[PDB]
Amino acid sequence: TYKLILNGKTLKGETTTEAVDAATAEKVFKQYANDNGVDGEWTYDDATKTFTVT
Numbered sequence: 001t002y003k004l005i006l007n008g009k010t011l012k013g014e015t016t017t018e019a020v021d022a023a024t025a026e027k028v029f030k031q032y033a034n035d036n037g038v039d040g041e042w043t044y045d046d047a048t049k050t051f052t053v054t
Contacts, residue, residue: 004029005052008038026051 002025003016019025029051043052
């Protein structure tokens with residue numbers, strides 16, 4: 001389970017996913033972000049398996 005923190009101006013929240021590798025998760029998250037109109041900067045922290053977009 002990897003988590004995505006979405007930090008936007010009109011939309012804020014968090015979500016999670018179960019994926020075999022970080023690369024696979026990123027693709028899932030990117031698709032989601034694109035679909036919900038959230039575009040920004042992505043960061044990944046391996047100790048907490050968290051991706052953040054701003």
